[PDB]
Structure formats: structure tokens, C-alpha cells
Amino acid sequence: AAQTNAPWGLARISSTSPGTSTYYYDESAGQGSCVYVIDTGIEASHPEFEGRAQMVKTYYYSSRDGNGHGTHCAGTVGSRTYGVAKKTQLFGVKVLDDNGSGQYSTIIAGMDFVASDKNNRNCPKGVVASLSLGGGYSSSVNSAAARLQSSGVMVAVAAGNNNADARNYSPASEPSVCTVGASDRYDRRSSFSNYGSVLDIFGPGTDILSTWIGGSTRSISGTSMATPHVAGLAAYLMTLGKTTAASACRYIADTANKGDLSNIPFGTVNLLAYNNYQA
Ligand SMILES: [Eu+2]
Ligand SMILES: [Eu+2]
């Protein structure tokens, strides 16, 4: 399948070079997989989700996304026009308030929730969790992310936006999950992206168009935007049978575009997520 005039990040993940505008992908499109988006919520009524999104848990007064951040990330995973895995099922867990903030105890509870809730869901091709959030180092937050991965869920987390070594941020610094940095449309590391030995992979993160609340769309930047590209790619690859939740991060790294990025400090991987699609 081919999507013409696609957002640049979708085109980039299906090409060996920058500057293309068509997203090439297999028609299976992540069907049979499930992605939990652990964030500010998802506006599940947005037409771009086609009935494939639902809220399953909130830690606040309402399950509504009053911010937009979670709806944008969910759109990059699996919306029709803006998503990597256009037929996946999306589940929202609201651990962040409508200002985009949340306490570590609530974030931990949301990860433990997903590890249990997945046993109630029909996800024959596998389960992914996308965490576009983080803060200062906490061993308890890292441990919760490690538990979620060990339970059989592919965990993708943002590296952080501090232009610093990700070893001082959580859950980015947990080795056992998939820690995602950001790149721009010219194959440079995004100017805000964290780096360091704990990063596993880069994805598109500067000027990413996706869904927004009120049935709208908007372009924003961050490692929060790169993370759902990798989460959606994992769901897509699991549906094709190429990898499993336990090994998806390693498979993505082994099959990535290598050496294409500039402004990568010594000691950080030079790997950009790539779907290896061949018609
Ligand atoms: Eu190349
Ligand atoms: Eu890792």
C-alpha cells in the first residue's frame, strides 16, 4: 500500500533516504495488535480513529483529554491519515492531568494497570505500550517500566527533551525498555533530543503533524512525537510475524537505517527506525 503526500515522518520510516513524500506499508497495517497510550487521554470520538480507540482507565475526575498531547501521540501510532499502524486498536490510560503533569506514583500505577488489563483484551498479534513522558531519575519508575516489559508488553519510552544524557531521566534510563530519541526532516538529531548510551533508536520528532482535540490537527515537536512512531512500527512488525514483544526493540535496531543521522555524539547509536517494506 502507498499513502501519497504523507507527513514527512511516515515517509521517512519507509525510505532509506530523506526527502521522500510517500509512505509505503503492508496492508495488514497492525490489525490484531493493541497499543496502550499512557498519557493525557485520547479523544476517541475523533473521526481519524474510525472507532478503533477507547479510554480504559483514568486517574483523574474525567477520562477526557483536556490537553491534546495524548491525542497527538495516539494519532501518530494509529490514526488513518497520520498513523504508522493504521488498523491497530488503541487503548488510552490517563496518568497525566490536563496541564500535562502527573505524580510518579500515578504513572507507576498506570504501568502496573496495563500489565494486568492486557489479560482481559483480545490482542492476538501482541501488545505495545507508548510512554511519551518522563522526569528526573527514579529507581521506582524504572522498575515499573521493567516490570511492564517483563510481563510481555513492548515498552517504548521518550528519551527526553533536555539536550542531555538520558541516564539522568526516567523511565528513559531503564535499559530493558526501548528508549527513543528524535530526528528532523534533514536527518539531524533534533536540537532538543537527549542522547547517550541508553538510547536504542531514533525516530522522527521535529514538526510532526497529527490529531488534536476538538476534532482538529496540529504540528508539534519532541521526543514525545518520536516515541509513537516506534511504538506503531513495533505493532506493525508484530502483526507481520517478524518479531515479538520481547525482541521488537532489538529487531528494530538491527533493521534500522544505519549511519544516516548527523549531530550524534560519540557513544550514541546512529540508528533510525525503518520498516524495510518491499512491494
Ligand atoms: Eu541512507
Ligand atoms: Eu534499551
Side-chain angles (χ1 to χ4, degrees), residues 47-113:
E48 280 284 326
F49 296 121
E50 306 174 299
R52 293 178 289 98
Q54 64 176 287
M55 284 306 294
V56 298
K57 179 78 185 178
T58 182
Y59 291 92
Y60 302 90
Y61 312 99
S62 172
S63 61
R64 179 185 290 141
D65 181 11
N67 181 278
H69 183 271
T71 295
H72 196 280
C73 302
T76 298
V77 175
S79 71
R80 173 201 83 151
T81 306
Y82 314 102
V84 173
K86 297 177 189 300
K87 288 172 186 166
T88 194
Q89 171 78 45
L90 296 157
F91 298 127
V93 182
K94 183 172 172 61
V95 298
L96 305 176
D97 68 24
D98 288 339
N99 293 305
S101 322
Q103 294 306 144
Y104 270 170
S105 55
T106 303
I107 291 162
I108 290 167
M111 311 180 228
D112 287 323
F113 172 83

Coordinates of all heavy atoms in Angstrom, one line a residue, residues 47-113:
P47 N -12.8 11.6 14.2 CA -13.0 10.7 13.1 C -11.8 10.0 12.6 O -12.0 8.9 12.0 CB -13.5 11.7 12.0 CG -14.1 12.9 12.8 CD -13.2 13.0 14.0
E48 N -10.6 10.5 12.8 CA -9.4 9.8 12.3 C -9.1 8.5 13.0 O -8.3 7.7 12.5 CB -8.2 10.8 12.5 CG -8.1 11.9 11.5 CD -7.5 11.3 10.2 OE1 -6.6 10.4 10.3 OE2 -7.9 11.8 9.1
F49 N -9.8 8.2 14.1 CA -9.6 6.9 14.8 C -10.6 5.8 14.3 O -10.3 4.7 14.6 CB -9.6 7.0 16.3 CG -8.5 7.9 16.9 CD1 -8.8 9.0 17.6 CD2 -7.2 7.5 16.7 CE1 -7.7 9.8 18.2 CE2 -6.1 8.3 17.2 CZ -6.4 9.5 17.9
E50 N -11.6 6.2 13.6 CA -12.5 5.3 13.0 C -13.1 4.3 13.9 O -13.4 3.1 13.5 CB -11.8 4.5 11.8 CG -11.1 5.4 10.8 CD -10.3 4.6 9.8 OE1 -9.4 3.9 10.2 OE2 -10.7 4.7 8.6
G51 N -13.3 4.6 15.2 CA -13.9 3.7 16.2 C -12.9 2.7 16.8 O -13.3 1.9 17.6
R52 N -11.6 2.8 16.5 CA -10.6 1.9 16.9 C -9.9 2.4 18.2 O -9.0 1.7 18.7 CB -9.5 1.7 15.8 CG -10.1 1.0 14.6 CD -9.0 0.8 13.5 NE -8.7 2.1 12.9 CZ -7.6 2.8 13.2 NH1 -6.7 2.5 14.1 NH2 -7.5 4.0 12.5
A53 N -10.4 3.5 18.8 CA -9.8 4.0 20.1 C -10.8 4.0 21.2 O -12.0 4.2 21.0 CB -9.2 5.4 19.9
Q54 N -10.3 3.6 22.4 CA -11.2 3.8 23.6 C -10.4 4.0 24.8 O -9.2 3.6 24.9 CB -12.1 2.6 23.8 CG -11.4 1.3 24.1 CD -12.4 0.2 24.4 OE1 -13.0 0.1 25.5 NE2 -12.5 -0.8 23.5
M55 N -11.0 4.8 25.7 CA -10.4 5.0 27.0 C -10.7 3.8 27.9 O -11.9 3.4 28.0 CB -11.0 6.3 27.7 CG -10.4 7.6 27.1 SD -8.6 7.7 27.1 CE -8.3 7.8 28.9
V56 N -9.7 3.3 28.7 CA -9.9 2.2 29.5 C -9.7 2.5 31.0 O -10.1 1.7 31.9 CB -9.1 0.9 29.1 CG1 -9.6 0.5 27.7 CG2 -7.6 1.2 29.1
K57 N -9.0 3.6 31.3 CA -8.6 3.9 32.7 C -8.3 5.4 32.8 O -7.6 5.9 32.0 CB -7.5 3.0 33.2 CG -7.0 3.3 34.7 CD -8.0 2.7 35.7 CE -7.6 3.0 37.1 NZ -8.6 2.5 38.1
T58 N -8.7 6.1 33.9 CA -8.3 7.4 34.2 C -8.0 7.5 35.7 O -8.6 6.8 36.5 CB -9.3 8.5 33.9 OG1 -8.8 9.8 34.2 CG2 -10.7 8.3 34.6
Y59 N -7.0 8.3 36.1 CA -6.6 8.6 37.5 C -7.1 10.0 37.9 O -6.7 10.4 39.0 CB -5.1 8.4 37.6 CG -4.8 6.9 37.5 CD1 -4.4 6.4 36.3 CD2 -4.8 6.1 38.6 CE1 -4.1 5.0 36.1 CE2 -4.5 4.7 38.5 CZ -4.1 4.2 37.2 OH -3.8 2.9 37.1
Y60 N -8.0 10.6 37.1 CA -8.5 11.9 37.4 C -10.0 12.0 37.4 O -10.6 10.9 37.2 CB -7.8 13.0 36.5 CG -6.3 13.0 36.6 CD1 -5.6 12.1 35.8 CD2 -5.7 13.7 37.6 CE1 -4.2 12.1 36.0 CE2 -4.3 13.7 37.7 CZ -3.6 12.8 36.9 OH -2.2 12.8 37.0
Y61 N -10.6 13.1 37.4 CA -12.0 13.3 37.6 C -12.8 12.8 36.3 O -13.9 12.3 36.4 CB -12.4 14.7 37.9 CG -11.6 15.3 39.0 CD1 -10.6 16.1 38.7 CD2 -11.9 15.0 40.3 CE1 -9.8 16.7 39.8 CE2 -11.2 15.6 41.4 CZ -10.1 16.4 41.1 OH -9.4 17.0 42.1
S62 N -12.1 12.9 35.1 CA -12.7 12.6 33.9 C -11.7 11.8 33.1 O -10.5 11.8 33.4 CB -13.1 13.8 33.1 OG -13.5 13.5 31.8
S63 N -12.2 11.1 32.0 CA -11.3 10.4 31.1 C -11.0 11.2 29.8 O -10.3 10.7 29.0 CB -12.0 9.0 30.7 OG -13.2 9.2 30.1
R64 N -11.6 12.4 29.8 CA -11.4 13.3 28.6 C -9.9 13.8 28.5 O -9.3 14.1 29.5 CB -12.3 14.5 28.7 CG -12.3 15.5 27.6 CD -13.2 16.7 27.9 NE -14.6 16.3 27.8 CZ -15.5 16.8 28.6 NH1 -15.2 17.6 29.5 NH2 -16.8 16.3 28.4
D65 N -9.4 13.9 27.3 CA -8.2 14.6 27.0 C -8.5 16.1 26.9 O -9.0 16.5 25.9 CB -7.5 14.1 25.8 CG -6.2 14.7 25.5 OD1 -5.6 15.4 26.3 OD2 -5.6 14.5 24.3
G66 N -8.2 16.8 28.0 CA -8.3 18.2 28.0 C -7.1 19.0 27.6 O -7.1 20.2 27.6
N67 N -6.1 18.3 27.2 CA -4.8 18.9 26.8 C -4.5 18.8 25.3 O -4.2 19.8 24.7 CB -3.7 18.2 27.6 CG -2.3 18.8 27.3 OD1 -1.7 18.4 26.4 ND2 -1.8 19.6 28.2
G68 N -4.5 17.6 24.7 CA -4.2 17.4 23.3 C -3.0 16.5 23.1 O -2.9 15.8 22.1
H69 N -2.0 16.5 24.1 CA -0.8 15.7 23.9 C -1.1 14.2 23.7 O -0.5 13.6 22.7 CB 0.1 16.0 25.2 CG 1.4 15.4 25.2 ND1 1.7 14.1 25.6 CD2 2.6 15.9 24.8 CE1 3.0 13.8 25.6 NE2 3.6 14.9 25.1
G70 N -1.9 13.6 24.5 CA -2.2 12.2 24.3 C -2.9 11.9 23.0 O -2.6 10.9 22.4
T71 N -3.8 12.7 22.6 CA -4.5 12.6 21.3 C -3.5 12.6 20.1 O -3.6 11.9 19.1 CB -5.6 13.6 21.2 OG1 -6.6 13.3 22.2 CG2 -6.3 13.5 19.8
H72 N -2.5 13.6 20.2 CA -1.5 13.7 19.2 C -0.6 12.4 19.1 O -0.4 11.9 18.0 CB -0.7 15.0 19.5 CG 0.2 15.4 18.3 ND1 1.4 14.9 18.0 CD2 0.0 16.4 17.4 CE1 1.9 15.5 17.0 NE2 1.1 16.5 16.6
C73 N -0.1 11.9 20.2 CA 0.6 10.7 20.3 C -0.1 9.5 19.7 O 0.4 8.7 18.9 CB 1.2 10.5 21.6 SG 2.2 11.8 22.3
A74 N -1.4 9.4 20.2 CA -2.2 8.3 19.7 C -2.4 8.3 18.2 O -2.4 7.3 17.5 CB -3.6 8.3 20.4
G75 N -2.5 9.6 17.6 CA -2.7 9.7 16.2 C -1.5 9.3 15.4 O -1.6 8.7 14.3
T76 N -0.3 9.5 15.9 CA 0.9 9.0 15.3 C 1.0 7.5 15.3 O 1.6 6.9 14.4 CB 2.2 9.7 15.9 OG1 2.0 11.1 15.6 CG2 3.5 9.2 15.2
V77 N 0.6 6.9 16.4 CA 0.5 5.4 16.4 C -0.4 4.9 15.4 O 0.0 4.0 14.6 CB 0.1 4.9 17.8 CG1 0.0 3.3 17.8 CG2 1.1 5.3 18.9
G78 N -1.6 5.3 15.3 CA -2.7 4.6 14.7 C -3.9 5.3 14.0 O -4.9 4.7 13.7
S79 N -3.8 6.6 13.8 CA -4.9 7.3 13.1 C -4.8 7.0 11.6 O -3.7 6.5 11.1 CB -4.8 8.8 13.3 OG -3.7 9.4 12.6
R80 N -5.9 7.1 10.9 CA -5.9 6.8 9.5 C -4.9 7.6 8.7 O -4.1 7.0 7.9 CB -7.3 7.0 8.9 CG -7.4 6.8 7.4 CD -8.7 7.5 6.8 NE -8.5 8.9 6.6 CZ -9.1 9.6 5.7 NH1 -10.0 9.1 4.9 NH2 -8.7 10.9 5.5
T81 N -4.9 8.9 8.8 CA -4.1 9.8 7.9 C -2.7 9.9 8.5 O -1.7 10.0 7.8 CB -4.7 11.1 7.7 OG1 -6.0 11.0 7.2 CG2 -3.9 12.0 6.8
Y82 N -2.5 10.0 9.9 CA -1.3 10.4 10.5 C -0.5 9.2 11.2 O 0.5 9.5 11.7 CB -1.5 11.6 11.5 CG -2.4 12.6 10.8 CD1 -3.7 12.7 11.1 CD2 -1.9 13.5 9.8 CE1 -4.5 13.7 10.5 CE2 -2.7 14.4 9.2 CZ -4.0 14.5 9.5 OH -4.8 15.5 8.9
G83 N -1.1 8.0 11.1 CA -0.5 6.9 11.9 C 0.3 5.9 11.1 O 0.2 5.7 9.9
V84 N 1.2 5.3 11.9 CA 2.1 4.3 11.4 C 1.3 3.0 11.1 O 1.5 2.3 10.1 CB 3.3 4.0 12.3 CG1 4.1 2.8 11.9 CG2 4.1 5.3 12.4
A85 N 0.5 2.5 12.1 CA -0.2 1.3 12.1 C -1.7 1.6 12.0 O -2.4 1.7 13.1 CB 0.2 0.5 13.4
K86 N -2.2 1.7 10.8 CA -3.5 2.3 10.5 C -4.7 1.5 10.9 O -5.8 2.0 10.9 CB -3.5 2.8 9.1 CG -2.5 3.8 8.7 CD -2.6 4.2 7.2 CE -1.4 5.1 6.8 NZ -1.4 6.4 7.6
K87 N -4.4 0.2 11.3 CA -5.5 -0.7 11.7 C -5.4 -1.2 13.1 O -6.1 -2.2 13.5 CB -5.7 -1.8 10.7 CG -6.3 -1.3 9.4 CD -6.3 -2.5 8.3 CE -6.8 -2.0 7.0 NZ -6.4 -3.0 5.9
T88 N -4.5 -0.7 13.9 CA -4.3 -1.2 15.3 C -5.4 -0.7 16.2 O -6.2 0.2 15.8 CB -2.9 -0.8 15.8 OG1 -2.6 -1.5 17.0 CG2 -2.9 0.7 16.2
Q89 N -5.6 -1.4 17.3 CA -6.5 -1.0 18.4 C -5.8 -0.1 19.4 O -4.7 -0.5 19.8 CB -7.1 -2.2 19.0 CG -7.9 -1.9 20.3 CD -9.3 -1.4 19.9 OE1 -10.0 -2.0 19.1 NE2 -9.8 -0.4 20.7
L90 N -6.4 1.0 19.8 CA -5.8 2.0 20.7 C -6.5 2.0 22.0 O -7.7 2.1 22.0 CB -5.8 3.4 20.1 CG -4.9 3.5 18.8 CD1 -5.3 4.7 17.9 CD2 -3.4 3.6 19.2
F91 N -5.8 1.9 23.1 CA -6.4 2.0 24.5 C -5.7 3.1 25.2 O -4.5 3.2 25.3 CB -6.1 0.7 25.3 CG -6.8 -0.6 24.7 CD1 -6.0 -1.7 24.4 CD2 -8.1 -0.6 24.4 CE1 -6.6 -2.8 23.9 CE2 -8.7 -1.7 23.9 CZ -8.0 -2.8 23.6
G92 N -6.5 4.0 25.8 CA -6.0 5.2 26.5 C -6.0 5.0 28.0 O -7.0 4.5 28.6
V93 N -4.9 5.4 28.6 CA -4.8 5.4 30.1 C -4.3 6.8 30.5 O -3.2 7.2 30.1 CB -3.7 4.3 30.6 CG1 -3.6 4.3 32.1 CG2 -4.1 2.9 30.0
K94 N -5.2 7.5 31.2 CA -4.9 8.9 31.6 C -4.2 8.9 32.9 O -4.8 8.9 34.0 CB -6.2 9.7 31.6 CG -6.0 11.2 31.9 CD -7.3 12.0 31.7 CE -7.1 13.5 32.2 NZ -6.1 14.2 31.4
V95 N -2.8 9.0 32.8 CA -2.0 9.2 34.0 C -1.5 10.7 34.2 O -1.0 11.0 35.2 CB -0.7 8.3 34.0 CG1 -1.1 6.8 34.1 CG2 0.2 8.6 32.9
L96 N -1.7 11.5 33.1 CA -1.3 12.9 33.2 C -2.6 13.8 33.2 O -3.5 13.5 32.5 CB -0.5 13.3 32.0 CG 0.8 12.5 31.7 CD1 1.5 12.9 30.4 CD2 1.8 12.6 32.9
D97 N -2.5 14.9 34.0 CA -3.6 15.8 34.1 C -3.7 16.7 32.8 O -2.9 16.5 31.9 CB -3.6 16.6 35.4 CG -2.4 17.6 35.5 OD1 -1.9 18.0 34.4 OD2 -2.0 17.9 36.6
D98 N -4.7 17.6 32.8 CA -4.9 18.4 31.6 C -3.9 19.5 31.4 O -3.9 20.2 30.3 CB -6.3 18.9 31.6 CG -7.4 17.9 31.3 OD1 -7.0 16.8 30.8 OD2 -8.6 18.1 31.7
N99 N -3.0 19.7 32.3 CA -1.8 20.5 32.1 C -0.6 19.7 31.7 O 0.5 20.3 31.5 CB -1.5 21.3 33.4 CG -2.6 22.3 33.7 OD1 -2.9 23.2 32.9 ND2 -3.1 22.2 34.9
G100 N -0.7 18.4 31.5 CA 0.4 17.6 31.1 C 1.3 17.1 32.2 O 2.4 16.6 31.9
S101 N 0.9 17.2 33.4 CA 1.7 16.8 34.6 C 1.1 15.6 35.3 O -0.1 15.3 35.2 CB 1.9 18.0 35.6 OG 2.0 19.2 34.9
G102 N 1.9 14.9 36.0 CA 1.5 13.8 36.9 C 2.5 13.4 37.9 O 3.7 13.5 37.7
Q103 N 2.0 12.8 39.0 CA 2.9 12.3 40.0 C 3.5 11.0 39.6 O 2.8 10.2 39.0 CB 2.2 12.2 41.4 CG 1.8 13.6 42.0 CD 3.0 14.5 42.1 OE1 2.8 15.8 41.9 NE2 4.1 14.0 42.4
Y104 N 4.7 10.7 40.1 CA 5.3 9.4 39.8 C 4.5 8.2 40.3 O 4.4 7.2 39.6 CB 6.7 9.4 40.4 CG 7.8 9.9 39.4 CD1 9.1 10.1 39.8 CD2 7.5 10.1 38.1 CE1 10.1 10.6 39.0 CE2 8.5 10.6 37.2 CZ 9.7 10.8 37.6 OH 10.7 11.3 36.8
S105 N 3.8 8.3 41.4 CA 3.0 7.2 42.0 C 1.9 6.9 41.0 O 1.5 5.7 40.9 CB 2.5 7.6 43.4 OG 1.8 8.8 43.3
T106 N 1.3 7.9 40.4 CA 0.2 7.7 39.4 C 0.7 7.0 38.1 O 0.1 6.1 37.6 CB -0.5 9.0 39.1 OG1 -1.0 9.5 40.4 CG2 -1.7 8.7 38.2
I107 N 1.9 7.5 37.7 CA 2.5 6.9 36.5 C 2.8 5.5 36.7 O 2.6 4.6 35.8 CB 3.7 7.8 36.0 CG1 3.2 9.2 35.5 CG2 4.5 7.1 35.0 CD1 4.3 10.2 35.5
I108 N 3.4 5.1 37.8 CA 3.7 3.7 38.2 C 2.4 2.9 38.2 O 2.3 1.8 37.6 CB 4.4 3.6 39.5 CG1 5.9 4.2 39.4 CG2 4.4 2.2 40.1 CD1 6.6 4.4 40.7
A109 N 1.3 3.4 38.8 CA 0.1 2.7 38.9 C -0.5 2.4 37.5 O -1.0 1.3 37.2 CB -0.9 3.4 39.7
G110 N -0.3 3.4 36.6 CA -0.8 3.1 35.2 C 0.0 2.1 34.5 O -0.6 1.3 33.7
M111 N 1.3 2.0 34.7 CA 2.0 0.9 34.1 C 1.6 -0.5 34.7 O 1.4 -1.4 33.9 CB 3.5 1.0 34.1 CG 4.1 2.4 33.6 SD 5.9 2.3 33.6 CE 6.2 3.9 34.4
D112 N 1.5 -0.6 36.0 CA 1.0 -1.9 36.6 C -0.4 -2.2 36.1 O -0.7 -3.4 35.8 CB 1.0 -1.7 38.1 CG 2.4 -1.7 38.7 OD1 3.3 -2.5 38.2 OD2 2.6 -1.0 39.7
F113 N -1.2 -1.2 35.9 CA -2.6 -1.4 35.3 C -2.5 -2.1 33.9 O -3.2 -3.1 33.7 CB -3.4 -0.1 35.2 CG -4.7 -0.3 34.5 CD1 -5.8 -0.8 35.2 CD2 -4.8 0.0 33.2 CE1 -7.0 -1.0 34.5 CE2 -6.0 -0.2 32.5 CZ -7.1 -0.7 33.2

